[PDB]
Amino acid sequence: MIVTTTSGIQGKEIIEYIDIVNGEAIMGANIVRDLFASVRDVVGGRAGSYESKLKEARDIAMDEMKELAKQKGANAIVGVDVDYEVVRDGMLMVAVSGTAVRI
Amino acid sequence: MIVTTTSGIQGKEIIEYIDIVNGEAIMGANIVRDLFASVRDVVGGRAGSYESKLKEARDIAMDEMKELAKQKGANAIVGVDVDYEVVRDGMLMVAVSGTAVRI
Amino acid sequence: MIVTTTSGIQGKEIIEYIDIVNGEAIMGANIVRDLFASVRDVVGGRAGSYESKLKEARDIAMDEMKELAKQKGANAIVGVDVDYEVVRDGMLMVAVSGTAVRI
Amino acid sequence: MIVTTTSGIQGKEIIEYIDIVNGEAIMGANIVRDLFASVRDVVGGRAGSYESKLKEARDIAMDEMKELAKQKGANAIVGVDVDYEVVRDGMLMVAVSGTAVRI
Amino acid sequence: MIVTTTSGIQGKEIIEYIDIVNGEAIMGANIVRDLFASVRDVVGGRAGSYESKLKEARDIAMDEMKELAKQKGANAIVGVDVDYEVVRDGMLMVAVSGTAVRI
């Protein structure tokens, strides 16, 4: 199913704006305590060890929103937003939102 | 009513831009520290304990915004944003914004 | 005057993109303490005493931006964004931004 | 040159998408303290003594972004975002972003 | 490849929305703490010492995202977002996102 951070799907028309949908996943204090504290210079995502866990939580959040959108009978999510929140300095949450849509 | 994170609604053009509407809900420190401090690795909202409360908060904020838009005579909200704010060590505030519109 | 979180005003043409405009309002550590950090479970905006103040602050920010756009001879604000920031230990800023425009 | 938080410029087609450009400015710990610490209830931008240094930090970030755009051959910036980040304990950073464009 | 905040590339047709892509880089506590420390009043980037490693970080995040879009078969990135998160005790992450697209 098509997911996009744009407001539309070029060439396709939206017949239905079904609902705003969301997904999240949380990374515990211990995981974020060490994979991020290991960083000493400017370390990118390929090189660093923090990315696969971050990407894992982001994909969990993505698929939750996808599953929710699909189970509402949508065939696209537009206007997708990706947000990161560090709750009590340890709990890094990744939240996704967007509009479940019929095209 | 129709709510969308997108700048417009396709096929139904906007007759009047009424106002910027908002809604919020706050999760208390005890509850945030309680349920969000869970997870020892990476856990989604789909299979968690914190989501239920986060989704409760998000839905309240959403309901508030739609109600306010109703009151203002709106029959759609476009350009919707869902953001999150760690207001203290504890609290998370979910804030929703968007433009109350009549189509 | 027309303020929208959308990129345009349907049916009307933007003649000039005059400037990016801003408004802020800051909430004191005591006010955030007493009203915001009191919340124990989940409290929405209609039920929380925090709201009248958050709305007051947000309305101050919005009015400050509108007037500043008025100063510049604009008759529209487009691409409006609402932001919240913990600016000092215990303090809360609402910052609004947008594009002052002539339709 | 033209700067806008909207996703485009009306009536003026984009010839080239040159680069995403960025600007920042930072206020010292001292500065945040002396102008924010004093705030008690709700204090807006027009009235607040904090507003001139903040607007100065923002205007510096903007100028630096505009200057980089100009150096890249651009004559407009579109999709401008304004960010506030408490970077060290005491200090506030204002970061701006957008796409440097040719119209 | 073309990277843009906009949802479309003017005079170019998006023939596939491939995937939402992401890039990150993290600045460790050292070069955050003892490199933003020199800030006094209000200091801009191209006059401060800090627009070196901060920019370097952004470029790594962007380069990561672009490289991932390339591996997915994309030849442009649209709806791009630049985010900043303080991740721990004085640690700055720049996270970028966008939709990997075929034009």
UniProtKB/Swiss-Prot annotation, chains A, B, C, D, E:
UniProt organism field: Bacillus cereus (strain ATCC 14579 / DSM 31 / CCUG 7414 / JCM 2152 / NBRC 15305 / NCIMB 9373 / NCTC 2599 / NRRL B-3711)
Top-level taxon: Bacteria
Span of the signal peptide: none
Protein name from the UniProt record: UPF0145 protein BC_1816
InterPro entries for this protein: UPF0145_dom_sf (IPR035439), UPF0145_YbjQ-like (IPR002765)
Pfam family membership, one: YbjQ_1
Coiled coil: none
Family assignment from sequence similarity: Belongs to the UPF0145 family.
Lineage of origin: Bacteria, Bacillati, Bacillota, Bacilli, Bacillales
SUPFAM superfamilies recorded: YbjQ-like
